[PDB]
Amino acid sequence: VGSLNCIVAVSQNMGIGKNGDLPWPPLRNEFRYFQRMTTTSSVEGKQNLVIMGKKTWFSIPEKNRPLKGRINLVLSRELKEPPQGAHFLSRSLDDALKLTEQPELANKVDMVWIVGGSSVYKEAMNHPGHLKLFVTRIMQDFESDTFFPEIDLEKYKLLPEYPGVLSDVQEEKGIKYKFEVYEKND
Numbered sequence: 001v002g003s004l005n006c007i008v009a010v011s012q013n014m015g016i017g018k019n020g021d022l023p024w025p026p027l028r029n030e031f032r033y034f035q036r037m038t039t040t041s042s043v044e045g046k047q048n049l050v051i052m053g054k055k056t057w058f059s060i061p062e063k064n065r066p067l068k069g070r071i072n073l074v075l076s077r078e079l080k081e082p083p084q085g086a087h088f089l090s091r092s093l094d095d096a097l098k099l100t101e102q103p104e105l106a107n108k109v110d111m112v113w114i115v116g117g118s119s120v121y122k123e124a125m126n127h128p129g130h131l132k133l134f135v136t137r138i139m140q141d142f143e144s145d146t147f148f149p150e151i152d153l154e155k156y157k158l159l160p161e162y163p164g165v166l167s168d169v170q171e172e173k174g175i176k177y178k179f180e181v182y183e184k185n186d
Ligand SMILES: COc1cc(N(C)C[C@@H]2CCC3=C(C2)C(N)=N[C@@H](N)N3)cc(OC)c1OC
Pocket: 007, 008, 009, 021, 022, 030, 031, 034, 056, 059, 060, 061, 064, 114, 115, 116, 136
């Protein structure tokens, strides 16, 4: 099976990218939380599937692509074939999810993680079913050119706690941040 999850790190001004990189300086424990959250599977035989748009894929340094221990799928209407290193290419969220039934991606996937960018996140939030949003709130403003959509607070609900998610405010390089989990089911 699995579940459908979105993971994102956002500045106060809802920024997630700037010219191909993150808006903020490197936050090592944020990177570690991202890697752990998306990689961990305790089902023998499966791996998580990570879904990302073209901009996100290329924002990841070549030394870190494909994301080890995970099935990498790029979502794009403009690419003609899977970028080098990616396992699959799909033209829409719908098709990607459809892909996780057919013979190859069915017996193999545990969780599904949507890791960016803006358009995929949009696609996903407006997708039927039970979605969880894993949100890293970076408590500072940063100049950005890519953003995360606002979260209807009325619609999604904030989970006071979730297993493997720290409750306390973190700090690195003088930047404070906290982890939050939201959920919906429509
Ligand atoms: C600039 O260097 C790097 C950039 C990236 N990007 C852009 C993907 C980002 C990383 C952090 C993050 C992402 C995806 C997310 N969707 N949700 C949260 N919470 N956090 C990934 C890297 O390694 C995996 C990397 O190498 C260290």
